[PDB]
């Protein structure tokens, strides 16, 4: 179910810029859309391996929930980008409430809010909108 999304997210989270450039080519992303996803990747790279591992735990437990392209997963991503830090972390808490996961949740969410402008936030969503409405998805 929606393989092309999870390949882009995995390419963002894993922190390798070259493998992300490959993903962005595969999904015909524009130069502003590329810029915005690389700023998201910087947050995983700056906050280390466990940011990938604990956010992978989060994305996994949402995707295998009762609620589940899953609208719960779509909702998680929009909150991560456009919601407030308390909104995102409280939403993550309903799926998994380990102190270390909520700690990691807030560290990433603060990073992207500090690092991305509103233009970058809008572009990440427009690139996501393409992915969600693709026939591959």
């Amino acid at each position, epitope marked *: 179910t929606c393989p092309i999304f999870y390949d882009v997210f995995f390419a963002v989270a894993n922190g390798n*810029e070259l493998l992300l450039d490959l993903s962005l*080519t595969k999904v015909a992303a524009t130069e502003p859309e590329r810029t915005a996803m690389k700023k998201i990747q910087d947050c995983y790279v700056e906050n280390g391996l466990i940011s990938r591992v604990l956010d992978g735990l989060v994305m996994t437990t949402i995707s295998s929930s009762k609620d589940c392209i899953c609208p719960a997963v779509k909702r998680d991503v929009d909150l991560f980008l456009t919601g407030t830090p308390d909104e995102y972390v409280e939403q993550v808490a309903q799926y998994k409430a380990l102190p270390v996961v909520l700690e990691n949740a807030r560290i990433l969410k603060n990073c992207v809010d500090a690092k991305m402008t509103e233009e970058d936030k809008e572009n990440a969503l427009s690139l996501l909108d393409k992915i969600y409405t693709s026939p591959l998805c």
Partner: antibody
Amino acid sequence: EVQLVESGGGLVQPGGSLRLSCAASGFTFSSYAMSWVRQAPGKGLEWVSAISGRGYNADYADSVKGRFTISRDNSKNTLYLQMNSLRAEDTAVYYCAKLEYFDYWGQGTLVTVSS
Amino acid sequence: DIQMTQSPSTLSASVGDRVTITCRASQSISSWLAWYQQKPGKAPKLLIYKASSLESGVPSRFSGSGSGTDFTLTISSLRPEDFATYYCQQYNSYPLTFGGGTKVEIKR
């Protein structure tokens, strides 16, 4: 247009060094991954190295790992390939190429390795 | 490391004939395969990307098809310009890998 122009190739002895250059223009260099592809006399194409948009990551062919270093100067729109400990096997035309599937190539630059 | 097996390495044809070049990957590469044409003393030119998408300017007698592990480049009605060497290349993952090449030659 989108032009890619290689330089720096020539004759080298086995064990020695070469720095290839590729001046790019006609597109925003820093948004895209660049590769180097090569071709020995009367043989096929062979991908040698790639580097990401801002240069934080690179990958290499096993035969060339540790010897070659790919790099870029995004302010000058130039791609580089420092080739060290060169071997007879490395004798080839070296092309720089844009993206991961090669829409635009340069005209190549020939590298010959011999005693 | 994904190995690309291109077949045949050689074929000779005439003007008007159909030409089919198969190319196969040792593991799945979805639709992430490209096709090139190379003439003597020149850089390759892209024909197909994404398995079947035609690059702009390329004539429509060229077509591609395939998914997963098995891919095909067909020329419908061969012209004199089309006698060349042809290459497949996967961009599913690094390292990027090419097929061995197929030489299309003039039958006599």
